[model samples]
Target: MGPGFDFAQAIMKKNTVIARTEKGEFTMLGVYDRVAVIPTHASVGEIIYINDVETRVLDACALRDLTDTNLEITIVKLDRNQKFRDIRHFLPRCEDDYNDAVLSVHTSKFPNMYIPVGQVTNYGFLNLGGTPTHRILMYNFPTRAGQCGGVVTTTGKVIGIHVGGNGAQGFAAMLLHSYFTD
Candidate 1:
């Protein structure tokens, strides 16, 4: 058991959500934490070891965008859809996300090419426990609203969910690495 959880909130003011499709498309940039992310480009049915976990999009508040809070941004083509068996036995140890460490990630543009670094503007949540959640804000970054529903990583390693943002800010579903326990 962990000490935090997620929401319902994303960006505000200029919201744009990707709708769920019958094609099993969990499209729209919803920002729930702890899931492998990929470009909308199909055959992106890509898979790998547990080390490959990822995520969101930015714009108006996701509160104004998403159709569901338990946003399963899963995009898989039916070649053989099987949930990755939860193998905590092989899961890597987690890092403490409470500190202000500069985080980085491998998103669409930089996939297998370059790494993008970001910082934490707001962490923790309005909850009494004093931890992170979907409400976690990563404002004033060099990122865009398109990088909204991407992954927030550290040295190419998975961390949190980069949800959404505007010209000067963004957010993440602050899962705290070790706290993806629903």
Candidate 2:
């Protein structure tokens, strides 16, 4: 069976939450089974509080990768003793899945009873003064400042992370399969 609204709701409830640190606040996404992604630009070494789970920043990177790209992100590694749980389902990594319809979950302004469903408009680069272009996805839905790192998915399989965008649209960074395979 395909994923449904209930599954998406459940996924958000179980794996996503508002992330707060001494520096700033944003949404945090759990993925790759043992990693939590924080999609804002900031340094590591701060305590990130997500729901009732307590953790510390393990790493941070720009969307570009080990080399360079665009977007930026922070990662937190989880151990067996940690209470965090990552999203277990994701759209198969393929070109066809890139354009799938997606729903973004957020709690910035509206927390319950509202999920923005939209289609992946296209893929492009974000040139914010960098060596190489940042790979990003443009979607038709709108999200807020605190919604960064929110999970974007089709049906219920995660495809990207809601980074940030304007009121009319938003940008996301693909949740690559390498995050799990590697």
Candidate 3:
């Protein structure tokens, strides 16, 4: 129930502190909500609807109001990964520049299966380069933080919303539903 919105599952208790000032290494901020909103603008195959709620993480600069809209929040770490490949190759007198980001080679007893096989659009373009990396072969099994405002479809193409991964084997991060369209 993404497009029309119906995602409610809360739990985000807080109490964090990791200091090291001097304009460097700071951690002590919490409270987050705004679970989903994939309105689609970066249009590739739109179906945006990731509106979300539920919050807590008190410290570091807490300010939560996601659906209420007033963006800005932080407190990170949520992981998953089974496959993620990044290949870089380019040589002109050793002038390196090439990174093929691939990560969808599963079959290890279903490793969190967050399948969206291809995507890296307009990423720091060196010229009109990449953005049609669709390989989400099908199967959207996103979970943790109650699916993190989930929603990511492929044959139906509504890609984005489900952020945070690659902490311990669950490579997640799908806030890419065209970045919310007009």
Off by over 4 Å in 3: 1-73, 76-111, 122-182
20-91 per-residue lDDT for model 3 (tens digits): 222222222111232222111112111211111122212222123333431222223212121111101110
The per-residue C-alpha lDDT of model 1 at residue 102 equals 31
Report the lDDT tens digits of candidate 2 across residue range 81-147: 5455545446446433344454545554546433555567546567422424355777776566666
For candidate 2, the per-residue lDDT at 96 reads 34
Give TM per candidate: 0.37, 0.75, 0.18
Off by over 4 Å in 1: 1-115, 125-139, 176-182
Clash tally for model 3 = 29
Clashing pairs in 2: 63-71, 64-68, 64-69, 70-134
Better of 2 and 3 by lDDT: 2
Candidate 1, residues 63-132: lDDT per residue as tens digits? 2113233321232222222333232222225334432323233333432211234355445342212322
* lDDT of candidate 2 at residue 7, scale 0 to 100: 62
